[PDB]
């Protein structure tokens, strides 16, 4: 019943690690996209105000 319990444990630990890893990568890709989005929104509002004033 053991080689079975240990094998299931190892496969679920492997799965666990793969998912935990896929996550540091998606949550990190994030701080990056959310920061890029805010940076662009602020560049947008600035140029929207400058177009009003040149118009």
């Amino acid at each position: 019943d053991l080689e079975r319990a240990e094998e299931r444990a190892e496969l679920s630990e492997g799965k666990c690690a793969e998912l935990e890893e896929e996550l540091k990568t998606v949550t990190n890709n994030l701080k990056s996209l959310e920061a890029q989005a805010e940076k662009y929104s602020q560049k947008e509002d600035k140029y929207e105000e400058e177009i009003k004033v040149l118009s």
């Binding site: 492997g14 690690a17 793969e18 890893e21 540091k24 990568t25 990190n28």
Partner: protein
């Protein structure tokens, strides 16, 4: 606080310097390890004549300077140009005065005795730091992953290493060095991507092949039936938009680049690859310590960040190791700074104070003192 705040950690690499204060979670300063020397006389608007350039100003202005790398394969090769990178680190990057900060530095795996004495000579005699300490890089990486025995596969910009460590002592005779790393890897992608029918013609095309390698490259497990997959042409492909519109597509080569780390034969290298080398390090160590090393393969370095590197290595050494063995490949997320973080921890530690080499030790014992 005197030095709790005050300890500096400088990790000198072949491609990047990582620097900051012991205590922080990540390097305050990261920048290329170059020193540019202007090919012509002249000035930028508003500045004076500059004899030299370091880090990013050397990279940005590379067209008018002759660029030089002080650290070849992890070892300091030019000491005039290294003292220049240190100067830049303290005074411009961290903006600290060095003469009131203890400095933890790092060196490479089988760093020649004479070098560890020379950077001590320059730290104490030209920068006048209060105290300093040189840690071995794999050893800080291991320790930053909590443990004290394990084997580190360390891979950055100019070198790859395997450093088996037992209760803190890195094992000299079992360490392996493979001179193929992220630098070699960007240049190989370059060719398989021009070979895909492309042109990285201007310098704004060159530089970004490296950003393609970092963002889109993969280490597939079963690299065999991944090429096979490439052919049926699934939605495996991946297009990147260049500085301009010029949408370049990379489907397949995406993983042909990190398969170079397992097959050096992709690049005319006759040396063995990462996984075999992990293993050979291990069958060069004492017998009784080999179960420990196998359950503690810690990975560190920019080039070990390719996703699925750990799964491929997992299966690469399970299938070479005796089945009675437990394999375990630890690859943390912050691994591009493991080395640095291990230094930050150690140097901010409560017990490390008694290993700092002080100017008292030095002025009295000569460079020999820190050399150990």
């Amino acid at each position: 606080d005197e030095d709790e705040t005050t300890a500096l950690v400088c990790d000198n690499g072949s491609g990047l310097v990582k620097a900051g204060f012991a205590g922080d979670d990540a390097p305050r300063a990261v920048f290329p390890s170059i020193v540019g020397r202007p090919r012509h006389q002249g000035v930028m608007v508003g500045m004076g004549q500059k004899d030299s350039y370091v880090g990013d100003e050397a990279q940005s202005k590379r067209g008018i300077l002759t660029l030089k790398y002080p650290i070849e394969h992890g070892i300091i090769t030019n000491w005039d140009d290294m003292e220049k990178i240190w100067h830049h680190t303290f005074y411009n990057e961290l903006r600290v005065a060095p003469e009131e900060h203890p400095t933890l530095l790092t060196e490479a795996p089988l760093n020649p005795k004479a070098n560890r004495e020379k950077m001590t000579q320059i730290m104490f005699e030209t920068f006048n730091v209060p105290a300093m300490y040189v840690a071995i890089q794999a050893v800080l990486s291991l320790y930053a992953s909590g443990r004290t025995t394990g084997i580190v596969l360390d891979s950055g910009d100019g070198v790859t290493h395997n450093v088996p460590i037992y209760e803190g002592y890195a094992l000299p005779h079992a360490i392996m060095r493979l001179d193929l790393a992220g630098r070699d890897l960007t240049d190989y992608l370059m060719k398989i991507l021009t070979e895909r029918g492309y042109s990285f013609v201007t310098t704004a095309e060159r530089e970004i092949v490296r950003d393609i390698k970092e963002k889109l490259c993969y280490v597939a497990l079963d690299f065999e039936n991944e090429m096979a997959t490439a052919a049926s042409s699934s939605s495996l492909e991946k297009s990147y938009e260049l500085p301009d519109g010029q949408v370049i597509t990379i489907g397949n080569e995406r993983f042909r680049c990190p398969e170079t780390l397992f097959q050096p034969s992709f690049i005319g290298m006759e040396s063995a690859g990462i996984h075999e080398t992990t293993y050979n390090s291990i069958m060069k160590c004492d017998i009784d310590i080999r179960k420990d090393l196998y359950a503690n393969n810690v990975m560190s370095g920019g080039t070990t960040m390719y996703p699925g590197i750990a799964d491929r290595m997992q299966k690469e050494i399970t299938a070479l190791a005796p089945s009675t063995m437990k394999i375990k490949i630890i690859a943390p997320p912050e691994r591009k700074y493991s080395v640095w973080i291990g230094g930050s921890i150690l140097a901010s530690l409560s017990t490390f104070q008694q290993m700092w080499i002080t100017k008292q030790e030095y002025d009295e014992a000569g460079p020999s003192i820190v050399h150990r």
